[PDB]
Amino acid sequence: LSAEDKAAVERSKMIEKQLQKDKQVYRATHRLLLLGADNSGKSTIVKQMRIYHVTSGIFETKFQVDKVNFHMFDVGAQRDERRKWIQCFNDVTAIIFVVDSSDYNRLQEALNDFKSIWNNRWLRTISVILFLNKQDLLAEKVLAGKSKIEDYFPEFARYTTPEDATPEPGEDPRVTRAKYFIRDEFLRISTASGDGRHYCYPHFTCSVDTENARRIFNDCRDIIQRMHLRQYELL
Amino acid sequence: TLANTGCWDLSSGNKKWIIQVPILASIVLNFILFINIVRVLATKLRETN
Amino acid sequence: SVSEIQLMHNLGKHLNSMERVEWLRKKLQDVHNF
Numbered sequence: 001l002s003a004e005d006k007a008a009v010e011r012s013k014m015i016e017k018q019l020q021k022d023k024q025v026y027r028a029t030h031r032l033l034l035l036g037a038d039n040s041g042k043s044t045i046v047k048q049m050r051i052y053h054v055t056s057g058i059f060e061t062k063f064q065v066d067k068v069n070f071h072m073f074d075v076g077a078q079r080d081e082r083r084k085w086i087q088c089f090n091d092v093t094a095i096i097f098v099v100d101s102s103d104y105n106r107l108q109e110a111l112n113d114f115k116s117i118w119n120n121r122w123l124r125t126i127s128v129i130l131f132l133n134k135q136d137l138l139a140e141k142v143l144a145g146k147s148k149i150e151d152y153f154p155e156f157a158r159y160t161t162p163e164d165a166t167p168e169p170g171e172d173p174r175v176t177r178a179k180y181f182i183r184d185e186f187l188r189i190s191t192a193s194g195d196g197r198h199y200c201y202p203h204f205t206c207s208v209d210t211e212n213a214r215r216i217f218n219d220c221r222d223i224i225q226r227m228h229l230r231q232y233e234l235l
Numbered sequence: 236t237l238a239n240t241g242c243w244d245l246s247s248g249n250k251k252w253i254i255q256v257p258i259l260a261s262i263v264l265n266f267i268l269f270i271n272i273v274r275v276l277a278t279k280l281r282e283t284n
Numbered sequence: 285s286v287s288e289i290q291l292m293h294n295l296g297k298h299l300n301s302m303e304r305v306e307w308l309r310k311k312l313q314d315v316h317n318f
Contacts, residue, residue: 196283199283222279222282225275225279226279229275229276229279234276235276235279235280242296244292244293244295244296245293245296245297245300246293246296251289251293254286254289255285255286255289258286259285259286
């Protein structure tokens with residue numbers, strides 16, 4: 001009797017020490033979910049973040065910047081339906097939503113997908129990092145002028161470049177007007193319901209740009225800091 | 236080991252600064268942190284209007 | 285300065301003065317009764 005209980009307790013305490021160590025590492029790393037249609041260059045981003053070395057189903061990529069670990073998960077071999085397996089991702093630090101800004105015709109589908117993610121009952125606290133990928137293709141298309149964004153979005157005719165926008169001096173004013181209109185459209189969905197519980201961080205991303213990791217790190221730092229402030233009822 | 240006279244209710248000189256100075260040193264440091272914390276609050280709210 | 289300690293020191297001086305003053309008062313009566 002006494003020997004068995006002592007052995008059982010000793011084993012239980014042995015498991016406890018392992019769990020405490022696992023708790024330290026689990027809290028240390030930040031989990032991220034990568035989402036987007038295939039028209040978006042999600043794969044290229046994965047290769048870029050693979051530089052930071054640390055039936056198929058979900059895949060995980062581990063990258064470290066400034067001595068903090070991220071685990072980015074992507075769903076490659078999964079069914080189109082996503083109303084069920086998206087619920088288990090309610091504890092991730094953030095969701096990286098990649099959008100191909102140069103499709104126009106498929107842009108509305110991205111808006112609807114963002115709308116569903118943003119307004120989900122269970123994803124009410126997970127911030128969304130919006131990456132408008134491959135802006136170079138959008139810039140080239142705008143200069144070419146063969147395809148006019150006005151046809152797909154009639155509002156674009158009555159759109160004016162935001163005063164707070166900071167375009168590059170050497171970039172066509174047409175390009176910035178187009179890209180910022182796309183940013184405004186996404187932010188309209190973001191601000192329609194989301195007020196203070198979770199936030200969206202728009203970004204202009206290129207497939208070859210290596211700055212994506214730094215943007216994610218900064219976005220994660222802001223999210224954690226905002227969460228800590230909310231715990232004190234300061235923000 | 237220096238005065239040991241009556242109760243310690245009275246002050247025998249500058250030795251009170253042994254306890255007073257560290258307490259005051261804490262207030263300024265906390266005050267500096269308080270201003271710094273207000274700074275990030277003014278920054279984040281600026282980022283979300 | 286630290287207020288609570290400062291108040292404590294002031295109280296000690298105030299009470300000590302009262303003991304001295306009351307000491308003077310009874311000495312005044314004793315000499316008057318000499």
